[PDB]
Design an enzyme around this catalytic site. Structure first.
Site, PDB file in Angstrom:
ATOM      1  CD  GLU A  22      -2.995  -0.942   0.140  1.00 34.58           C
ATOM      2  OE1 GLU A  22      -3.190   0.205  -0.782  1.00 34.58           O
ATOM      3  OE2 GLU A  22      -4.319  -1.745   0.202  1.00 34.58           O
ATOM      4  CG  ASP A  31      -7.072   3.672  -5.030  1.00 34.50           C
ATOM      5  OD1 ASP A  31      -7.578   4.022  -6.206  1.00 34.50           O
ATOM      6  OD2 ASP A  31      -7.741   2.789  -4.274  1.00 34.50           O
ATOM      7  CG  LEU A  43     -11.464   3.524  -0.351  1.00 34.51           C
ATOM      8  CD1 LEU A  43     -11.030   4.285  -1.729  1.00 34.51           C
ATOM      9  CD2 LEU A  43     -12.401   2.548  -0.677  1.00 34.51           C
ATOM     10  CG  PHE A 115      -6.251  -3.653   4.133  1.00 39.85           C
ATOM     11  CD1 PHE A 115      -5.816  -2.832   3.229  1.00 39.85           C
ATOM     12  CD2 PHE A 115      -6.073  -3.326   5.307  1.00 39.85           C
ATOM     13  CE1 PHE A 115      -5.272  -1.661   3.570  1.00 39.85           C
ATOM     14  CE2 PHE A 115      -5.638  -2.199   5.826  1.00 39.85           C
ATOM     15  CZ  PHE A 115      -5.184  -0.959   4.940  1.00 39.85           C
ATOM     16  CG  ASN A 143      -9.141 -19.769 -11.424  1.00 42.87           C
ATOM     17  OD1 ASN A 143      -9.943 -19.539 -12.090  1.00 42.87           O
ATOM     18  ND2 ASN A 143      -8.266 -20.808 -11.519  1.00 42.87           N
TER      19      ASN A 143
END
EC number: 3.2.1.17
Length: 175
Positions: A22, A31, A43, A115, A143
């Protein structure tokens, strides 16, 4: 591995992991998805209105920030957010059994994923969750690499996916 390399895992944990993925920013910034963010991946809002993001910030911090916080404040908010992600997993009937089945390092990747994406987003990866519980690590990683989460912002997600594949901290070495 040297004595030093064997020590590296004791230096890694969910906080150091998310701190790498982050970054740490003391001023509001956008972001990779264009969402106002601050601190260590906090956020603020998905609104494109900087004023809403500053309002959320002052609410989150509890003072008049005008878009800037201290490192100590970034860390407290980060600790709150990590706790929220962990709590979101453990109370969820879908995520908890998969989390419980995981080893310690993959549990960090799990918390990291939540998160970043939120509980409902993660709980919606039905196939990946089954693969993880069945220890099908390669398939799970392949995946995850199809997801919009990863594909829209690869640099923030790539190390998490690698960690799900390997259950080691190798992706966090040699920054």
């Amino acid at each position: 591995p040297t004595t030093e390399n064997l020590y590296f895992q004791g230096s890694m944990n969910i906080f150091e992991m998310l701190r790498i993925d982050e970054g740490l920013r003391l001023k509001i910034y956008k972001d990779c998805e264009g969402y106002y963010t601050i601190g260590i991946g906090h956020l603020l809002t998905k609104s494109p209105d900087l004023n809403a993001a500053k309002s959320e910030l002052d609410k989150a911090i509890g003072r008049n920030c005008n878009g800037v916080i201290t490192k100590d404040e970034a860390e407290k908010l980060f600790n709150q957010d990590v706790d929220a992600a962990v709590r979101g997993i453990l109370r969820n009937a879908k995520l908890k059994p998969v989390y419980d089945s995981l080893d310690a390092v993959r549990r960090c990747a799990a918390i990291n994923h939540v998160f970043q994406m939120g509980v409902t987003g993660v709980a919606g990866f039905t196939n990946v969750l089954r693969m993880l519980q069945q220890k099908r690590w390669d398939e799970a990683a392949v995946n995850l690499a199809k997801s919009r989460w990863y594909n829209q912002c690869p640099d923030r997600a790539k190390r998490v996916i690698t960690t799900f594949r390997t259950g080691t901290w190798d992706a966090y070495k040699n920054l």
